[PDB]
Amino acid sequence: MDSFWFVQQWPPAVCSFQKSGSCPGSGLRTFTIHGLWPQQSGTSLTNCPGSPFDITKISHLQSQLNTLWPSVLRANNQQFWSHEWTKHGTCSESTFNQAAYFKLAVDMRNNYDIIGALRPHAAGPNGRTKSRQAIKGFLKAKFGKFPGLRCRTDPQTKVSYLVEVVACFAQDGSTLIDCTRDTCGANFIF
Numbered sequence: 674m675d676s677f678w679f680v681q682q683w684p685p686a687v688c689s690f691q692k693s694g695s696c697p698g699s700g701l702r703t704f705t706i707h708g709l710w711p712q713q714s715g716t717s718l719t720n721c722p723g724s725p726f727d728i729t730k731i732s733h734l735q736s737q738l739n740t741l742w743p744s745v746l747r748a749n750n751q752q753f754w755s756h757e758w759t760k761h762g763t764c765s766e767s768t769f770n771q772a773a774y775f776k777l778a779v780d781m782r783n784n785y786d787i788i789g790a791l792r793p794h795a796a797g798p799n800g801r802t803k804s805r806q807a808i809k810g811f812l813k814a815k816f817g818k819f820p821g822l823r824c825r826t827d828p829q830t831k832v833s834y835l836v837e838v839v840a841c842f843a844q845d846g847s848t849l850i851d852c853t854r855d856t857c858g859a860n861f862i863f
């Protein structure tokens with residue numbers, strides 16, 4: 674691997690695409706963790722052979738994880754953590770055991786407060802249009818490097834909404850680096 678994609682999701686937006694059934698994210702008002710994805714040559718490394726998920730290894734982080742890494746789609750958080758470990762976390766296990774991997778995600782979330790970085794510049798979420806350049810610029814100014822924005826288009830209205838924000842890190846998992854990929858157009862709703 675040569676880097677990490679620390680992916681945070683905006684719960685309400687993610688759930689807005691679930692036009693049927695329940696979705697706990699419809700009631701959250703802060704960015705939460707989707708995953709910490711090891712990267713290599715511009716691609717996400719997935720399903721690397723590794724240790725099976727073991728909840729006991731992160732028993733000391735259950736408060737932080739239930740708060741910062743809840744499943745916004747369903748009510749089983751541990752299942753979500755297990756899936757993220759098996760599909761992504763195992764790919765960085767050569768240097769980060771399970772305990773250190775989840776602790777890394779927790780620390781990253783606590784040190785990358787997206788709303789806190791936007792609020793002062795009148796860029797916080799208000800259901801209205803935002804500029805891709807403006808949002809990335811505010812985050813760059815606050816954190817020092819460009820984030821990767823992720824948008825999704827409503828199949829009905831074709832309106833584009835910001836759904837995730839990626840913070841790119843070097844292989845050391847602490848040094849931020851510029852992201853180089855956005856799935857957002859020049860403008861979107863946030």
Ligand SMILES: Nc1nc2c(ncn2[C@@H]2O[C@H](COP(=O)(O)O)[C@@H](O)[C@H]2O)c(=O)[nH]1
Binds near residue numbers: 736737779783
């Ligand atoms: N922002 C933030 N809140 C946390 C974190 N860990 C726990 N919390 C929250 O802070 C309060 C105290 O958590 P505790 O210190 O008992 O683990 C709870 O309301 C809990 O949801 C964390 O790492 N960051």
Ligand SMILES: Nc1nc2c(ncn2[C@@H]2O[C@H](COP(=O)(O)O)[C@@H](O)[C@H]2O)c(=O)[nH]1
Binds near residue numbers: 682744746747757760
């Ligand atoms: N994006 C996302 N997927 C979730 C969440 N809770 C559970 N999941 C499950 O995790 C899968 C995501 O896999 P990933 O894209 O991280 O490899 C989804 O297909 C879904 O079944 C959540 O809050 N966000």
